[PDB]
Amino acid sequence: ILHSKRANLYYLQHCRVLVNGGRVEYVTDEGRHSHYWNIPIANTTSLLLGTGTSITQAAMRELARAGVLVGFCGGGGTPLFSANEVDVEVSWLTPQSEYRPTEYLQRWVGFWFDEEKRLVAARHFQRARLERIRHSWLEDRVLRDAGFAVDATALAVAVEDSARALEQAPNHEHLLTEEARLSKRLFKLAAQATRYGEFVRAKRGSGGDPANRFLDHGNYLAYGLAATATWVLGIPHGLAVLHGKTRRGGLVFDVADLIKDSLILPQAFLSAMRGDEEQDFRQACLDNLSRAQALDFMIDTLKDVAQRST
DNA sequence: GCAGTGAACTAGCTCCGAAAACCTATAACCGGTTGATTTCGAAGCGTTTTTTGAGTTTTTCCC
């Protein structure tokens, strides 16, 4: 249930959170034996209330006493609906509320306005993304066994070439387009491996074939996971690195990018070819995300870029 | 003047479709002959027509 070992983030489902006798208690079908009792309550913990759960104001009081962030997310924890805002660590605020302020916003803003540094960040994002493609498509054979048998030499050549291109070109405007070309080739490779036939990527949900729908669902979950990552870091969604400065919710899409083609896309084609239900697809996606430590990776990346930007 | 959307735009690509560019045979055209018949023309001024130009009014087309 520990959703991110890097963030001390826990997912609670099928239980009520209430305060009896001055201690926050979980009313669950397992009673005393539920693992929720092992939840450490400290300023380092952060909760994610899941499906079928409710919380009492008294609990909110006790958690605030202990300084524990709370957030509501849907099935499996991908769509993050609402959460507590996290503080910002600077010398002029200084409340004693015992809430672990986080300093990453200052680091982010310290460079966000300098375009050259912003570009350097974009490059760093894409380096990470490609290396996660090469990892999941080649190094690990779980997909191979599942049925996603694809050629390697063509994929390796394409990825090598795109990586070679990343280290070049002057502005965001090229990077976006280079990624788009890589995207197209990856789609073609996946369709060939899946024997799905010809594939064309419609957008704004105009597609009707299973592949398109499953891609949309997968991307929706990925966005939710990224939103969780940013919220844990406290960075507002508007300070995008690679998407346009006017794009509402740009940053989450920047962060979501580092898994779409690594983990969502193959599963979308696999499930479409296998003829799965939408529910089966959702469960498979969440299982893949859990297996890959996705949230932890996207946390590590954001921290790495912050430290590297100095 | 603002918040908002939709249109113009980005790189390089394979991949695909089309007009462009090139090769071939050969039928029509090129050159040579005779020579009595008809056709054409040397200057140039006046007449008549074209056809170019000149403007535009109207009509038609496309959106």
UniProtKB/Swiss-Prot annotation:
Changing residue 257 to A: Almost complete loss of endonuclease activity. InterPro entries: Cas1, CRISPR-assoc_Cas1, CRISPR-assoc_Cas1_C, CRISPR-assoc_Cas1_N, CRISPR-assoc_Cas1_YPEST-subtyp. It comes from the Bacteria. CRISPR (clustered regularly interspaced short palindromic repeat), is an adaptive immune system that provides protection against mobile genetic elements (viruses, transposable elements and conjugative plasmids). CRISPR clusters contain sequences complementary to antecedent mobile elements and target invading nucleic acids. CRISPR clusters are transcribed and processed into CRISPR RNA (crRNA). Involved in the integration of spacer DNA into the CRISPR cassette. Acts as a ss- and dsDNA-specific endonuclease. Mn(2+) supports cleavage of ss- and dsDNA, while Mg(2+) only supports digestion of dsDNA in vitro. Its EC number is 3.1.-.-. This is CRISPR-associated endonuclease Cas1. It holds the Pfam family Cas_Cas1. Transmembrane segments: none annotated. Mn(2+) binds at residues 179, 243, 257. It comes from Pseudomonas aeruginosa (strain UCBPP-PA14). PANTHER family: CRISPR-ASSOCIATED ENDONUCLEASE CAS1, CRISPR-ASSOCIATED ENDONUCLEASE CAS1 1. The keyword Protein biosynthesis does not apply. Belongs to the CRISPR-associated endonuclease Cas1 family. Keywords: Antiviral defense, DNA-binding, Endonuclease, Hydrolase, Magnesium, Manganese, Metal-binding, Nuclease. Inhibited by EDTA. It is an enzyme of class 3 (hydrolase). One of its GO terms (molecular function) is DNA binding. One of its GO terms (biological process) is maintenance of CRISPR repeat elements. Homodimer. This bacteria does not encode Cas2; Cas1 must interact with a different protein to insert spacers. Changing residue 179 to A: Protein is unstable. Its cofactor is Mn(2+); Mg(2+).
